[PDB]
Amino acid sequence: KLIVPQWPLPKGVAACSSTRIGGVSLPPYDSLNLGAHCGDNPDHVEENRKRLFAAGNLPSKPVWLEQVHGKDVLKLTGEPYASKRADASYSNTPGTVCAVMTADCLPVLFCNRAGTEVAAVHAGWRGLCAGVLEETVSCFADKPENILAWLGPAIGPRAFEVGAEVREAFMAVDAKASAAFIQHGDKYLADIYQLARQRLANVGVEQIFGGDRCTYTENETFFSYRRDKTTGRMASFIWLI
Amino acid sequence: SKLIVPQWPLPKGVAACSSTRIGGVSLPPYDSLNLGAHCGDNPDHVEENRKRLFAAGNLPSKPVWLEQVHGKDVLKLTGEPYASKRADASYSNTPGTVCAVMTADCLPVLFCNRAGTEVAAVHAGWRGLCAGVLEETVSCFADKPENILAWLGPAIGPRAFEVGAEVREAFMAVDAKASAAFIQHGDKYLADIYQLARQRLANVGVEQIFGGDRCTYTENETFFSYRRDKTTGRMASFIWLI
Ligand SMILES: [Zn+2]
Ligand SMILES: [Zn+2]
Ligand SMILES: [Zn+2]
Ligand SMILES: [Zn+2]
Ligand SMILES: [Zn+2]
Ligand SMILES: [Zn+2]
Ligand SMILES: [Zn+2]
Ligand SMILES: [Zn+2]
């Protein structure tokens, strides 16, 4: 089964986010593991990808990134790439699939109401803190007012334990980050949805959706790196039809 | 009443209890003896519920709460500098140390030996049960399985535990005895977790098995149930050497 973002989806845009359900992989990758570098059977991963691309009605294969937990955006201008080293992608080309691979990190999908540009972001805390979302938004020709954002399944505020330094880093950029951390031993529990919403507001994006799942809690629906260590991967996808 | 006392031949030197949703201070949907600190409850209420339970249970120390990940790892409670509390079972041979597991549908299993020198507590979700958490816990004991007692705590029962074909498949890949513990329910099955546990226990030589008569999902006035409620409190099961 496939998560369909609950937002006012514009006419020529289409989106989906995968779960752990309905694949072919064996534990600890059971069953719809999309990740090719976490030690799964390579023929199973290939099979899960095929089923998910069918289930999601993707028009072409996703442009998978070399995700490095940074803040760079690849503009999906053309099929042979000089380097896919990026944690976000941007497209204004019909049929081109933006894709981001996650199991705890925040997926964010963007599109404009006019339905002429899309973006997908893999926003781990470091990339989020350093401004991956602001950098993705800045790629859009449209104005932020016209931009929709969907917050995908990520590790939620009851499970995302971070060190004092992480909380420190977020407040160094934007002091109101403080409300997104709650003390918990020598650490804090952090609300990644709250932090993403703050960055998005600071940049003018007001139509924000999703943010109601937790990859760590919902173990029957999602892989979680923090929970499992060795485990599968989900992905979120957006494209212009 | 905040507490269930396992009904088994409790050895001298051992004590155990398992909590209910009754007798605490938490507000709905955590009403009222919620012990879980990570389900969105008022944490002052959670600490009061814990104080109340620990008092009533006559625990000699605070529980060694695990970071439960629904796997099959057993932490031997050898001494508080631990590299990681990521585990779904614990084992102690140290008087005064409390083994504890936190549940609201998953099977709690408490273990001890007739001599009263070793205890263990297991949070057995279906994934961990399937991958062999009970067998793993049993193999931590120095004593022989014949001298091991096992108590099945309140879990989601065979009329409520609905699973996909894949769960049945997984269990029967380990042992086709497992087919007995499943009954079709549409394109689904209703699974008997107590039956699956009893099969693993027998496989391993544990013959003295008690409890397994409750249903967290049915008894909404005694137990929290994650399947029933989603946002809800947590019970826990505890055992220790006196
Ligand atoms: Zn295969
Ligand atoms: Zn990540
Ligand atoms: Zn959670
Ligand atoms: Zn905690
Ligand atoms: Zn109160
Ligand atoms: Zn559980
Ligand atoms: Zn029915
Ligand atoms: Zn029942």
Curated annotation (Swiss-Prot), chain B:
GO molecular function: adenosine deaminase activity; copper ion binding; oxidoreductase activity; S-methyl-5-thioadenosine phosphorylase activity
Pfam families: Cu-oxidase_4
Matching InterPro entries: Cu_polyphenol_OxRdtase, Cu_polyphenol_OxRdtase_sf, Cytotoxic_necrot_fac-like_cat
Keyword Disulfide bond: no
Coiled-coil ranges (or none): none
Cofactor: Zn(2+)
Chain residues that bind Zn(2+): H70, C106, H123
Reactions that this protein is recorded to catalyse: adenosine + phosphate = alpha-D-ribose 1-phosphate + adenine; S-methyl-5'-thioadenosine + phosphate = 5-(methylsulfanyl)-alpha-D-ribose 1-phosphate + adenine; inosine + phosphate = alpha-D-ribose 1-phosphate + hypoxanthine; adenosine + H2O + H(+) = inosine + NH4(+)
E.C. code: 2.4.2.1, 3.5.4.4, 2.4.2.28
Keyword tags: Copper, Hydrolase, Metal-binding, Oxidoreductase, Transferase, Zinc
KW Oxidoreductase (keyword) present: yes
NCBIfam families, per database record: peptidoglycan editing factor PgeF, PRK10723.1
Role description: Purine nucleoside enzyme that catalyzes the phosphorolysis of adenosine and inosine nucleosides, yielding D-ribose 1-phosphate and the respective free bases, adenine and hypoxanthine. Also catalyzes the phosphorolysis of S-methyl-5'-thioadenosine into adenine and S-methyl-5-thio-alpha-D-ribose 1-phosphate. Also has adenosine deaminase activity.
Family: Belongs to the purine nucleoside phosphorylase YfiH/LACC1 family.
Protein name in UniProt: Purine nucleoside phosphorylase YfiH
Native organism taxonomy: Bacteria, Pseudomonadati, Pseudomonadota, Gammaproteobacteria, Enterobacterales
Gene: yfiH
